[PDB]
Amino acid sequence: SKGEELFTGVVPILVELDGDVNGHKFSVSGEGEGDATYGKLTLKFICTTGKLPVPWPTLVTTFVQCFSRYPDHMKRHDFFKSAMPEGYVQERTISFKDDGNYKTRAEVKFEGDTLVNRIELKGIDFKEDGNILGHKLEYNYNSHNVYITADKQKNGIKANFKIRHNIEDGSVQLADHYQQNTPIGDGPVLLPDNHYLSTQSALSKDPNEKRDHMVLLEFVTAAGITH
Ligand SMILES: [Mg+2]
Ligand SMILES: [Mg+2]
């Protein structure tokens, strides 16, 4: 199909987010590249407004699942690439257990040859000395499965998953994710059978970077269907 062919090589990525969490307003810019042939993403994010008022890991899922590797036998289930180049809206509610929530609305599409993720994020109901506003989360990331189901009435998909953020005391802060994707354009899109994205992420720091930032290396493979 047309949109999957846009991803057979290395594709430059731009991410731009504006956020307001409990009235703390901030912006982040990111750049990198994806190689969906290998399910591979490399991204660097910079807080352009100063210090990020929430922990970097809490934003990883919000900051391009079109770069997932869909095995050849699963290509007919790849909604994300099928919506390209016109793109898709991706919306989430992220519910931090015993704390606040983020609501995100993003548009993922090509601008020229560059894959862009533009996000508005709103966070409310956070506790002033909870794990988020209190910055009690370790700078690391666990592996998780993203469970995808079709949403035919919206010509799109939904997903549900649980992200676990490690707390500095050794405990875990659960972030329940509910997700909806809808295509922006008028091209045909693929409505998938149930499957999941097996996702692993590593966070690091650029030793030469003094702005508040995050480097992300992520690998994602679609799975759960055998033939
Ligand atoms: Mg291929
Ligand atoms: Mg731990």
Residue numbers in the entry: 2 to 64, 68 to 231
From the paper:
The chromophore of wild-type GFP in the ground state exhibits polymorphism in the chemical structure. The X-ray structures of the T203V variant and wild-type GFP were determined at 1.2 Å and 1.48 Å resolution. The conformations of the residue at position 203 are gauche- for both. Gln222 in the T203V variant and Glu222 in wild-type GFP are in the same conformation as Gln222 in the T203V/E222Q variant. On the other hands, weaker hydrogen bonds longer that 3.0 Å were observed in the T203V variant and wild-type GFP as well as the T203V/E222Q variant at pH 5.0. The side chain conformations of the residues at position 203 in the A-variants T203V and T203I as well as in wild-type GFP are almost identical to those in the I stabilizing variants T203V/E222Q and T203I/E222Q. This indicates that the conformation at the position 203 is the same in the A and I states. On a plot for the two structural parameters, the three states appear in different regions. In other words, structures spectroscopically suggested to be in the I state (T203V/E222Q and T203I/E222Q) is positioned in the low right area in the plot, while those to be in the A (T203V/E222Q at pH 5.0, T203V, T203I and wild-type GFP) and B (S65T and E222Q) states are in the middle-high right and low left areas, respectively.
